[PDB]
Design a binder for this molecule. Structure first.
Ligand code: NA
Ligand code: NA
Ligand code: NA
Lengths: 245, 55
């Protein structure tokens, strides 16, 4: 009935540290990843009714799906809304070449709704163009800014790895299977607790998942953009884990 | 220089820990980075607990 990448609540599209509070449920693929104890530690991106995409280091504490709870359709972090879904992980799938990305099998396929819709996947080895404005979302640390406790968004330009790897920026750390994004002056960035969440770029019709929030030098510092896993370099692996499972 | 100045790459996960300065760090990596910096070693900063201070 629904299709990927198409929010039924129009995003706010601001000009997570900085950014703004999102319009509730304008990022319907945003997941909150919690331990059995039920508290938010990572984001995630719904790929399809049963599967989630997240960062590997979100999983490096327990190899057991019973230790993970994915929260779908949420806007508030602690006082979850009444429609929100709470589905338990059944399998975890680590990227085999030790990259910071992983897949989660949902025990009960989440029901798609006006507030729970998956994101679209890029085409293999697509390279987001330099200065493309994309969005990052999540519940992570806010540093001095507003909106702690609610889903935030930030609109940020991609910086091509070539520039991002220059010495004054991230000095050779980034490499091919990752992308950069952020403002040269700082002040707007994902941060701790946003890991594993989406970086999406609008393409004509819909949003495309192009990055997975991964790491950085601090958060929102000048000359230090955030680093994201390049989702397009992995789609051929994602489908197979869904395909062959 | 970067290690000494407290500039380190860290995952953006929220797994808070407690330093001996009674400050909560949002994950072990961030605390590890300050511990090894000049200002952390200045204050004999160390990890005291594997949860947020007071939580
Ligand atoms: Na949501
Ligand atoms: Na927060
Ligand atoms: Na890039």
């Amino acid at each position: 009935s629904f299709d990927c990448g198409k929010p039924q609540v129009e995003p706010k599209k601001c000009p997570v540290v900085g950014g703004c509070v999102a319009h509730p449920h304008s990022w319907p693929w945003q997941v909150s990843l919690r331990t059995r104890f039920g508290m938010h530690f990572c984001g995630g991106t719904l790929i399809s009714p049963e599967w989630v995409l997240t960062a590997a280091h979100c999983l490096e504490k327990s190899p057991r799906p019973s230790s993970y709870k994915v929260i779908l359709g949420a806007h508030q972090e602690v006082n979850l809304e009444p429609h929100v879904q709470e589905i338990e992980v059944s399998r975890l799938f680590l990227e085999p070449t030790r990259k910071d990305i992983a897949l989660l099998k949902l025990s009960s396929p989440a029901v798609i709704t006006d507030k729970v819709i998956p994101a679209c996947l890029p085409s293999p080895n697509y390279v987001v163009a330099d200065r493309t404005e994309c969005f990052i979302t999540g519940w992570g640390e806010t540093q001095g800014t507003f909106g702690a406790g609610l889903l935030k968004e930030a609109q940020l330009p991609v910086i091509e790895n070539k520039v991002c790897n220059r010495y004054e920026f991230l000095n050779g750390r980034v490499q091919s299977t990752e992308l950069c994004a952020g403002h040269l002056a700082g002040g707007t960035d994902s941060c701790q607790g946003d890991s594993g969440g989406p970086l999406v770029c609008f393409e004509k019709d819909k949003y495309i998942l192009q990055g997975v929030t991964s790491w950085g030098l601090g958060c929102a510092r000048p000359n230090k953009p955030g680093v994201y896993v390049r989702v397009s370099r992995f789609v051929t692996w994602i489908e197979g884990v869904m395909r062959n499972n | 220089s970067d290690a000494e100045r407290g500039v380190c790459a860290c995952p953006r996960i929220y797994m808070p820990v407690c330093g001996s300065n009674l400050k909560t760090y949002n994950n072990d990596c961030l605390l590890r980075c300050e511990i090894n910096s000049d200002l952390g070693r200045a204050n004999n900063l160390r990890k005291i607990a594997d949860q947020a201070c007071d939580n």
